[PDB]
Amino acid sequence: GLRSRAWFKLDEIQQSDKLFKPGMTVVDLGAAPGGWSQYVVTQIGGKGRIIACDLLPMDPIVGVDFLQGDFRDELVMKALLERVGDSKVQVVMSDMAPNMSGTPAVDIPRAMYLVELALEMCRDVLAPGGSFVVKVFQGEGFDEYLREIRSLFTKVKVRKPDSSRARSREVYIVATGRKP
Numbered sequence: 001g002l003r004s005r006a007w008f009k010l011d012e013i014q015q016s017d018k019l020f021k022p023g024m025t026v027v028d029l030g031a032a033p034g035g036w037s038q039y040v041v042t043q044i045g046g047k048g049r050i051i052a053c054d055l056l057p058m059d060p061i062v063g064v065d066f067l068q069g070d071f072r073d074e075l076v077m078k079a080l081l082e083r084v085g086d087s088k089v090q091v092v093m094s095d096m097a098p099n100m101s102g103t104p105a106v107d108i109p110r111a112m113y114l115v116e117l118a119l120e121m122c123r124d125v126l127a128p129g130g131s132f133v134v135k136v137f138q139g140e141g142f143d144e145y146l147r148e149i150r151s152l153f154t155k156v157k158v159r160k161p162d163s164s165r166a167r168s169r170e171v172y173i174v175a176t177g178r179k180p
């Protein structure tokens, strides 16, 4: 197809939640191969920009400052913050997912650690009034994580994009209005 399933999932979320506007600065976590950043550039336009990160390398995209590295490493976090600089960040988007073993009691904790790191980054860099979109899996830790997100944002919705495989346990938490 012309675009990836991931690109279509974000397009569906943009349609339901209107997260991306012209000129915004966006952080893209777990960006490879680049569908979400590709999609967001069409919305924020040439004057907006994205600071992206993934363990894997990916094709460059004009307007996207991409840093290959392990988001769990504080050194990588520091380098991402050097790319954000004093730019106000209006949206943090995370599609990070760990390598899956196939065993829930192992995969869920692995995944939950990554989304907790994404939320912590929201606390530090997401501007007041900003948004967060994050891939989360159903099951252990979901309730507590949604609660943590609801305490940091004004409105929170749980989305299951039509393009998201009904067989997959993923959902996308879409939070808006980051609190002061």
Ligand SMILES: C[S@@+](CC[C@H](N)C(=O)[O-])C[C@H]1O[C@@H](n2cnc3c(N)ncnc32)[C@H](O)[C@@H]1O
Pocket: 004, 006, 007, 029, 030, 031, 032, 033, 034, 035, 036, 037, 053, 054, 055, 056, 069, 070, 071, 072, 095, 096, 097, 098, 099, 114
């Ligand atoms: C679902 S794919 C992302 C697809 C992306 N949204 C797109 O549109 O192309 C998830 C990605 O998360 C990344 N990931 C997982 N753990 C990570 C970590 N510790 N640091 C950075 N990226 C990580 C992977 O390497 C994998 O590329």
